[PDB]
């Protein structure tokens, strides 16, 4: 894997290290929790623990988002990955309407 | 094929090391300047030039990209000039003054256990410095290890904590392996002495998973011995001289998967001495 | 100005009930064979069947789709005193699994529908005994467990009831219970059931004494308006009544329209979010469409046959 990575086939190293046995050795650091969509509580996971409902709603589709998701650290809004790619391929402002120019506030 | 790069420096180049992928063939000379030149697509462009030393610069060693684009420069002025490339521009980032003599060599730790740019102090010791984050680097030094000063620091490969280890040598006509203890203070574990003259360069071979460790030691006497230990507990380095260099052996570098030991000496020639089936090593250059 | 079309749909005979989806590409059908089938409209518009599986021993009374805000969920009501909650999962052919069910009702369930989106993922079912139980499962992420939030008795034979579209918390929730009893004595075929937030209970806001004829279905359109909404009654003579809100808040009920062009007992009613069209299907076998006009006068707009 550490030869493949030097070669430049980041996908291939992922396929090879799929088959290692000893855990993934999870990293410890800063974690991104989410304010819940109903009771506004900080829930670390896919579903809230009080209302047991969805915690993140799409700012484009207004539907629950569970898989890949993009967000900016400035305006605190996120949504579906494909949806944000489509929205930001053209525009330079927040489809959440807050005026946060995420294209320059999250490209760090 | 071969791509030729013009050094374009007022003094002869004395060091070289390329990027992990390999795009950035750095050059260092005695002109008090070490620069960066891009070599992509068979090119030669002076992408960035640096000048922050006092006298000659003897070494240039790189960093693993997982910790960013970082160099390491050793200079006769008893200082280390770490250079980073931020926002497409190169700029100095750190310095040291912990050595009373010219720093011989600086080599990087293997990335699996953090960042450590260990360097030797050419009086009796070395200087191991691990960045602690947020621009905090702490220097921990040895206490009178080499007789006249270490020359090259070789980094042992990772093993399955972490059991940190490395090897070193100098003009003491011997090579010693230095092991970091659990308390954090390095404690010597073994000593090897076979070089009839001063030892210039010591190289530690990279690992692939086999149960063996190999070390190639150069010396002023011109002996290139591939010290091997067939057991992980024997700690009995069995030397075997491979060639008789006419002059002092200058450098020793190994292959990507521990196949060929590159050597350059006083003959201004490079011999790619690779071993054989019968246990001998015959140059194929 | 009525256009009728026929599409290539593969089916054996008539089905029990059918539904659609807000995305416009998903539709479901429940046939007489006590099996659940799903047909999805393609990007080109063609409806492609995606699943087919039995539901319960009893015949499938009715089928109701669910809100996209809560996930891909479908509800089934069976004539075997049981209600089935099945969720489609694709591993990529889909596989629909009844992750939960509701058979608390002793007798066969007439119908069950999804409640307002503003009250959580809650649903209720009404059986022929006049008892309607509303179960509210707090676990939105886990549909297996269901908690019976409420139960209401209409004291009359319940066959088709629709919860009022009052969802916003700015007002109180209400539910409209229908009836299909054939009692010779006249009685209120409908009643207004509004939940009391302070009392945490639903009380009979008003009994629609204006309805005594047999009623097959009740349809109240989504408000999306300003003042209030209206509902419809599927009977021998179709009538439309407007509620004017003043315990439960009094409302002034008065006829807004009355249509009898089908000249039969209305069975199913069409839906119109716009609110300018009030169409229903009578027992005459001919589709009847009526709509309001510039004079705010409801009148027949289109007509088509079943064939
Ligand atoms: Zn919540
Ligand atoms: Zn979306
Ligand atoms: Zn933003």
UniProtKB/Swiss-Prot annotation, chain A:
Zn(2+) 1 binds at residues 36, 39, 48, 51. Zn(2+) 3 binds at residues 72, 100, 102. The gene is WDR59. It is found in: Lysosome membrane. A zinc finger (RING-type) spans 55-107. A zinc finger (C4-type) spans 35-54. The chain holds residues 867 to 974 of 974 of the full protein. Component of the GATOR2 subcomplex, composed of MIOS, SEC13, SEH1L, WDR24 and WDR59. The GATOR2 complex interacts with CASTOR1 and CASTOR2; the interaction is negatively regulated by arginine. The GATOR2 complex interacts with SESN1, SESN2 and SESN3; the interaction is negatively regulated by amino acids. Interacts with DDB1-CUL4A/B E3 ligase complexes. The lineage of its organism: Eukaryota, Metazoa, Chordata, Craniata, Vertebrata. This is GATOR2 complex protein WDR59. As a component of the GATOR2 complex, functions as an activator of the amino acid-sensing branch of the mTORC1 signaling pathway. The GATOR2 complex indirectly activates mTORC1 through the inhibition of the GATOR1 subcomplex. GATOR2 probably acts as an E3 ubiquitin-protein ligase toward GATOR1. In the presence of abundant amino acids, the GATOR2 complex mediates ubiquitination of the NPRL2 core component of the GATOR1 complex, leading to GATOR1 inactivation. In the absence of amino acids, GATOR2 is inhibited, activating the GATOR1 complex. Zn(2+) 2 binds at residues 61, 80, 83. Belongs to the WD repeat WDR59 family.
From Swiss-Prot, chain B:
The modification Phosphoserine is found at residue 168. Keywords: Acetylation, Cytoplasmic vesicle, Endoplasmic reticulum, ER-Golgi transport, Lysosome, Membrane, mRNA transport, Nuclear pore complex, Nucleus, Phosphoprotein, Protein transport, Repeat, Translocation, Transport, WD repeat. It is a peripheral membrane protein. Signal peptide: none annotated. The GATOR2 complex is negatively regulated by the upstream amino acid sensors CASTOR1 and SESN2, which sequester the GATOR2 complex in absence of amino acids. In the presence of abundant amino acids, GATOR2 is released from CASTOR1 and SESN2 and activated. Gene3D superfamilies: YVTN repeat-like/Quinoprotein amine dehydrogenase (2.130.10.10). Functions as a component of the nuclear pore complex (NPC) and the COPII coat. At the endoplasmic reticulum, SEC13 is involved in the biogenesis of COPII-coated vesicles. Required for the exit of adipsin (CFD/ADN), an adipocyte-secreted protein from the endoplasmic reticulum. As a component of the GATOR2 complex, functions as an activator of the amino acid-sensing branch of the mTORC1 signaling pathway. The GATOR2 complex indirectly activates mTORC1 through the inhibition of the GATOR1 subcomplex. GATOR2 probably acts as an E3 ubiquitin-protein ligase toward GATOR1. In the presence of abundant amino acids, the GATOR2 complex mediates ubiquitination of the NPRL2 core component of the GATOR1 complex, leading to GATOR1 inactivation. In the absence of amino acids, GATOR2 is inhibited, activating the GATOR1 complex. This is Protein SEC13 homolog. It comes from Homo sapiens. The gene is SEC13.
UniProtKB/Swiss-Prot annotation, chain C:
This is Nucleoporin SEH1. One of its GO terms (cellular component) is lysosomal membrane. It is found in: Chromosome, Centromere, Kinetochore; Nucleus, Nuclear pore complex; Lysosome membrane. Component of the Nup107-160 subcomplex of the nuclear pore complex (NPC). The Nup107-160 subcomplex includes NUP160, NUP133, NUP107, NUP98, NUP85, NUP43, NUP37, SEH1 and SEC13. The SEH1 subunit appears to be only weakly associated with the Nup107-160 subcomplex. Component of the GATOR2 subcomplex, composed of MIOS, SEC13, SEH1L, WDR24 and WDR59. The GATOR2 complex interacts with CASTOR1 and CASTOR2; the interaction is negatively regulated by arginine. The GATOR2 complex interacts with SESN1, SESN2 and SESN3; the interaction is negatively regulated by amino acids. It holds the Pfam family WD40. The GATOR2 complex is negatively regulated by the upstream amino acid sensors CASTOR1 and SESN2, which sequester the GATOR2 complex in absence of amino acids. In the presence of abundant amino acids, GATOR2 is released from CASTOR1 and SESN2 and activated. Belongs to the WD repeat SEC13 family. There is a cross-link at residue 12 (Glycyl lysine isopeptide (Lys-Gly) (interchain with G-Cter in SUMO2)). It comes from the Eukaryota. WD repeats lie at residues 10-49, 55-91, 104-145, 153-203, 210-246, 261-300. Its main location: nucleus. GO terms for molecular function: structural molecule activity. GO terms for biological process: attachment of mitotic spindle microtubules to kinetochore; cell division; cellular response to amino acid starvation; cellular response to nutrient levels; defense response to Gram-positive bacterium; mitotic metaphase chromosome alignment; mRNA transport; negative regulation of TORC1 signaling. Keywords: Cell cycle, Cell division, Centromere, Chromosome, Chromosome partition, Isopeptide bond, Kinetochore, Lysosome, Membrane, Mitosis, mRNA transport, Nuclear pore complex, Nucleus, Phosphoprotein, Protein transport, Repeat, Translocation, Transport, Ubl conjugation, WD repeat. The modification Phosphoserine is found at residues 172, 183.
